[PDB]
């Protein structure tokens, strides 16, 4: 109909206006400005501890707030809590469903969350008078596989699923307080702000979106990729974020100015990106690839400064401690590695 | 050097390791099967005969099976298929009485072509290079009554034959089995079953026994 055509024309005109406004504020580039800064010295990191005990591929890994304990998830039906300093096992939690793709550790240290291929997010309580680990809540309101889950507090959680929608839950009740919609494809990753007031989501339509926890609607939409988006994370300041795609390219996006700052890609890289993380000061960007090795990039000058190569299979999960002292990497070889 | 509690912590870790090893040694003694289809291909009758994600368990002749049905997913297949990289066999179901039907979404495109392209996508995947496929063609009876009223020239406009129950079935089987592009690493089994049957379990038993023998031969370096 004519109304649909005129609405599409209006949408195209709004897109053109947004593009023109974005081009208006682009006066210079970071590369020219960062030319004068001293380059980062070539970096070597070594494997300090190796963690073994799994018997299948490892899909998820999340650090604790004390920078000593971590949690690992594999498709053998086990969720294992590791003490990194002494390489010990504190808890081994059996799971009813063995098809896991994500896990989360509560900031306080009282709960752990898991889920995947069963539309159910399970919360496990670690401190119990009976002396064991028990199920505290099974949230079931999604129609697709769960990609990522993050905690806001001991009685809140944010979840992204393959049903294009994201949800905010209340653990004590068990109901979706807010639902976020607007994507045109699957959702793979989400990142929480340090202020607990913003979060971004990345989708398989080459798009990132910014959401408010309270109000529940979208402010900004970022495009520029060419394939699926598999990882995303914030800069420690909170005014920028890094996106990793399946087209062998990472990009850095700014929130104050809705634009793209820098891209990180090399000719020899033809594989995808599975994990992205930052350092404590925001100078080093760590990326995990399917070429069985991880790379370190300078966040300002876009030059590679180091390669971590100790895994025999695809690197699936990468994490950096809160104090910025060690880096944890996992793979489908059923081994975790701590690098310093 | 360690204190009195560090030794107890190490003992707890050792006990956890022992339990994990004991559970892993038991989890490997199970046969795993992945069941696919095209929605109305007849999954229910197959499950009823041989009995997010659905898990089914059964036992035949001291062999323990474990069948995974993932028909109720409704998402992109390429983002979670690699989870099933080490499955013993894939059971594919095709309802061949849909050569005349058409899909609800489009009146120009028929269901059999969707089944064929899904089979082509699954067979030539990068994760299933050495995975056996067991193809069950379902509800042949309704086919044998329906073939006389309407021919199968509607689906394939390049078929010339006697238009009987045997020639059409042979043509369909040949068309399905010609989509394979390995012919050496992968082997395809075909069978015809109806609603009332009792020999499907024996067929899958023979197939999985052959796969087990081949895997053991490969493990010893003698293959």
């Amino acid at each position, epitope marked *: 109909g004519s109304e649909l055509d005129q609405l599409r024309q209006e949408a195209e005109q709004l897109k053109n206006q947004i593009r023109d406004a974005r081009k208006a504020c682009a006066d210079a580039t970071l590369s020219q400005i960062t030319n004068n800064i001293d380059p980062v010295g070539r970096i070597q990191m070594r494997t300090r501890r190796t963690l073994r005990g799994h018997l299948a591929k490892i899909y998820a890994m999340h650090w604790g707030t004390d920078s000593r304990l971590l949690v690992s998830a594999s498709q053998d039906g086990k969720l294992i809590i590791w003490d990194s300093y002494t390489t010990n096992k504190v808890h081994a939690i059996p799971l009813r469903s063995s098809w896991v793709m994500t896990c989360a550790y509560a900031p306080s240290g009282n709960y752990v969350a898991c889920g995947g291929l069963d539309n159910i997010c399970s919360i496990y309580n670690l401190k119990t008078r009976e002396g064991n680990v028990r199920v505290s809540r099974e949230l079931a309101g999604h129609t697709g596989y769960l990609s990522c889950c993050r905690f806001l507090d001991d009685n809140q959680i944010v979840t992204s699923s393959g049903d294009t929608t994201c949800a905010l839950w209340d653990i004590e009740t068990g109901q979706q307080t807010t639902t976020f919609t607007g994507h045109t494809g699957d959702v793979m990753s989400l990142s929480l702000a340090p202020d607990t007031r913003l979060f971004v989501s990345g989708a398989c339509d080459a798009s990132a979106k910014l959401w408010d926890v309270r109000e529940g609607m979208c402010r900004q939409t970022f495009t520029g990729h060419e394939s699926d988006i598999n990882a995303i994370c914030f800069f420690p300041n909170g005014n920028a974020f890094a996106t990793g795609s399946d087209d062998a390219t990472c990009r850095l996006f700014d929130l104050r100015a809705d634009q793209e700052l820098m891209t990180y890609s090399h000719d020899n890289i033809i594989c995808g990106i599975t994990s992205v993380s930052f350092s404590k000061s925001g100078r080093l960007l760590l990326a995990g690839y399917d070429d069985f090795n991880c790379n370190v990039w300078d966040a300002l000058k876009a030059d590679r400064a180091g390669v971590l190569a100790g895994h025999d299979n695809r690197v699936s999960c990468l994490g950096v401690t809160d104090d910025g002292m060690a880096v944890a990497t996992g793979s489908w070889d059923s081994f975790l590695k701590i690098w310093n | *050097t360690l204190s009195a509690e560090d030794k107890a912590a190490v003992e*707890r870790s050792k006990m956890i390791d022992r339990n994990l090893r004991e559970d892993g040694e038991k989890a490997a003694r199970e046969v795993k099967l992945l069941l696919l289809g095209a929605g109305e291909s007849g999954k229910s009758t197959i499950v009823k005969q041989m009995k997010g994600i659905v898990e089914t368990h059964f036992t035949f002749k001291d062999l323990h099976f474990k069948m995974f049905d993932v028909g109720g997913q409704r998402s992109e297949r390429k983002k979670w298929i690699h989870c099933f990289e080490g499955v013993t066999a894939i059971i594919f179901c095709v309802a061949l009485s849909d050569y005349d039907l058409v899909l609800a979404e489009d009146e120009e495109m028929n269901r059999m072509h969707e089944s064929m392209k899904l089979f082509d996508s699954i067979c030539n995947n990068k994760w299933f290079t050495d995975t056996s496929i067991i193809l069950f063609l379902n509800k042949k009876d309704l086919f044998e009554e329906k073939i006389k009223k309407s021919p199968l020239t509607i689906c394939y406009p390049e078929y010339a034959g006697s238009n009987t129950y045997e020639e059409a079935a042979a043509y369909i089987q040949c068309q399905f089995e010609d989509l394979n592009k390995r012919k050496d690493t992968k082997e395809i089994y075909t069978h015809f079953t109806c609603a009332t049957d009792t020999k499907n379990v024996q067929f899958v038993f023979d197939a999985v026994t052959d796969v087990i023998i081949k895997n053991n031969l490969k493990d010893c370096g003698l293959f």
Partner: single-chain antibody
Amino acid sequence: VQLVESGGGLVQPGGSRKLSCSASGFAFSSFGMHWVRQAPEKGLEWVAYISSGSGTIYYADTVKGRFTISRDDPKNTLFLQMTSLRSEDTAMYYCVRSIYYYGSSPFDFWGQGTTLTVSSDIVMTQATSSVPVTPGESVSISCRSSKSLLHSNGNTYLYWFLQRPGQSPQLLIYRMSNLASGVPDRFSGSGSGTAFTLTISRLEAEDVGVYYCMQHLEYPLTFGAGTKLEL
């Protein structure tokens, strides 16, 4: 959760007898077990310890060779066999749970006690033996040892617990800085090296009893003489 023990009768100066304890409410197989002996009108001392899996068994020097420990996991029952009894083995016995991992709180439940009547080591010193007090004023108790309890890993193995009259001991503080579960925030602990202080800010009617400090660097486990507190 509750542990109930029995089997205690009167025996002649020469004989044998066995005691049993049954637990209900927790995973028994994942908890190590301790036996504690308290003499009449005296302090309490450690006797024996059995670990999870029955791999490590520890006895005291004063009872080595005479007492036997055993565990039954399917039936959830811990036994103790008294083979030869002197005249000094007349006391009341407790049963204590223990768990050991990063962040654990061992010696958390004590259960009840059973009475039995017959017809190198770190010394723990508490100089104070009685303290008169009026409710509403802060109180401090001091505890000292012969060797520093600080280890190379940064942990100090000091324990503070309480005993009410006609009741069983309850844990208050573990590792001299961590407040246990189910206890008010009034209590606090601190110290350094060999000197340790336990402070109570506000005292009420339920704070009257005997207080004990304990070490956990090495076996055997040694308790200190009680510091009674009177209203």
